[PDB]
C-alpha cells in the first residue's frame, strides 16, 4: 500500500574518456609480488624497494597534470616478461616502461606491441631506452649520462619519467620544447650533434631558452613509408589517431554487435552516430572541423561480385539499398588538426 | 615652434643576415646607413629574447619564442604573434609602425608577412 | 570463417598516375676505381 | 661612491669615454661587449665594498677575530 | 574585498540509498566527499518530515507526504510539489538551486524529474 519517493541522481559528461592517460608499470621485486593500482598520490606500499619508490615518484608528477591512472605490477625478475604480457593483455594500458628492460626484453616487448597493433587492433605504446625497431608505436629515448637534481639517473629511469610527463601532457599542447626544472646537470653537447641525433629519430634533452628541454617529439620510427608521410613521424598525430580508433572500436562493441541488426536504416543511424562522434572531436582542436562519413560503395561492388549479381539494369542507389549480408562498408574523410611547433615568417 | 630634430644616421657593424656571422671589409666592418641599421636592429631584437639573458634591458626582448613548441592553436596565436611583433619592434624610436598581413598554414612550417615603416 | 567486426583504417595519399620518367641523365665515363654504376640520386655525393 | 657605482652608471660612463664613428644604440655589438665587462666591474665594486666591512675590526667573523686575537 | 571562503568537504557515514541501511567498510563507514554528502542529506531531508518527530529543528522537514494519499488533483499539485521540493532542498547552504522538469501520469504511480545544482 506504500509507494515511496526513490530518487537517484544522474550526471552527464559532454566528454567521454576511454583508454587515455594509462601508465603500465612493471618492476622486479621479491617482496611485493603483485599488482597495485595507484589512484591517489603518495600511496607507497612498504614492500617496494627504494629504487622502485624513486620510479613511482618520477611517474607521479607531470608537466601540466598528474597522470590520470598509475598501474604497477610486481613479480620476480625471472619469467617477468611472460607475466607482464599476460597482465597487459588482461588490462588495457596506454604507455609501458620497464626499469630493467634488456635488449632482448625490449625487442620482445616491441614485437608483442606491434603484433597487438597489427592483429588485435589494440593501439598501445611503449617507451624504451635503446631500440632501433621499425615501428612508430614504440618510443626510443637515447640520451646517456642523464643526471636530474644532481643525482645520477639511468636511461630507463628518465624514460619512465618522460613517459609519465607525456601522460600528463594535454593534446592541445605539444611535447616539443617542454623544459624540465628538475634536470640541472647534463653533459655538454653541440647543436650539430643534437640536430643529428634528432634527425636519427631519437629523443634527447637540449639546453635552450635558459632551460633544459627536449628538442622534438618525433616518433622512434626512422623509416616512414610513402603513405605515412611527415605527420606520421610525429607521436602527436598517432596519439589522436589511436584514441579515435579505440573510441570507435569501443562504441561499436558496446552498441552495434549483437544488439543492433543490419539494415539501411541501421546503416543511416550508424553513419549519424559516427558523424556525431566526429563533430565531438571537431569541438576539440585535435581534428579539422570538416569531415565526411560515407558508405564504402566499391566494397559493396566487391560484395556483389562475390554474390554474383549483375551490375546492369538497376539504379546505382539500389547497390546501397541492397542488403550486404550482415555487413556494413563505410568510408570517412578525416584530417588531423595538430598545430605548429615551429614558425618561419618574412618581413618587408 | 622649433621643428623636430632628425635622427642621425645609425652606424654600426654589418653582416649577412643569412650568414649570421660578422663580415669584415679589408678589416673594416661594413658601414650601415639609411635603411641598413634598422634591419640589423630588428634581427637582433627578434632573434633573441631578453628574459633568457640577464645583461639586456627589461624593455628589450620578444616573447615569440613562447609560441615556439606549439603551446596553443594557430587561430588566435596569429593575432597574438602580430601583437608580440608590434610590441617588440615599435620600441625603436627609428621605426614608426609595423603591420602584419596574414599567416600561411602548411604542414608544420608557418609563414607570415609583416611590414615595416621607416623614416628615411 | 567466423564473422567478426573488422574495422580498417587507411591513410589517404593523393595517387596520380605516373608517366614515363623525364629529365634523367645517363652519365657514362671511364675509371679504374670501383668499376660499376653509381646511381647518384642524392645531391652532392661524389663516390671515392 | 660604491653605491653610485652600478652597471648602468658605469655603462653610460664608458659609452661617453668611447667616441667613435659608428652610432651608439641599444642592442649594438659594442654595447653588449661593454655591458658584460661593466657587469663584471659592478661585481668587482660589490667585492670592494665588502672589503671595507671585512677589513674593519668590528663585525668580524670567526677567522677574522681569530687572526686579530692571535 | 575578501573572497568568500569555500565550504569544506562534508564528511559523514555512507550507505546504499536503495539498501536504506548503513554500510561498513572493514568496520569504517564509507567516506563521502565532493558529490557524495549532498545526496545523503537530500535523501534524509526528503524521506522523513520534521513535524512527525519533535527532535528535529523546525526549519528541517518537507510537506510532500501531505500530498500522499490523494488529497488533491494532480494538475496543481505538480507545481505545489515542485515548490515544496524547492523549499525543502534550498535550505542547505551547499545546494545552489533545484529545478523540476515535469511529471508523468500513469495509473497510481507519479514519476517526476527534478534537477540539483551543486558547488563542487
Numbering used by the authors:
A (entry chain h): 6 to 353
B (entry chain l), E (entry chain J): 16 to 135
C (entry chain b): 4 to 51
D (entry chain o): 1 to 70
Copied sentences from the primary study:
Here, we report the atomic structures of an engineered diffocin, a contractile syringe-like molecular machine that kills the Gram-positive bacterium Clostridioides difficile. Specific attachment of baseplate tail fibers to receptors on the surface of a target bacterial cell triggers conformational changes of the neighboring baseplate, which leads to reorientation of sheath proteins and contraction of the entire sheath assembly.
CryoEM data processing of the post-contraction diffocin particles resolved two different substates, an apparent transitional state and a final state, which is 2 nm shorter in length. Using the same strategy, we determined the cryoEM structures of the collar, trunk, and baseplate in the transitional and final states at 3.6–6.1 Å resolution. The baseplate wedges in the transitional and final states are almost identical, with both presenting a post-contraction conformation. By comparing them to the pre-contraction baseplate wedge, we observed repositioning of the dimerization domains of Tri2A and Tri2B, along with a twist of the trifurcation unit relative to the core bundle; the dimer interface between neighboring triplexes is, however, preserved. Although the conformational change in the diffocin baseplate wedge is less dramatic than in R-type pyocin, where the iris ring breaks apart after contraction, it is still sufficient to initiate the contraction and release the bound hydrolase domain of the hub-hydrolase. When the dimerization ring receives a triggering signal from the tail fiber, the conformational change of the triplex will cause the release of the hydrolase domain from the dimerization ring.
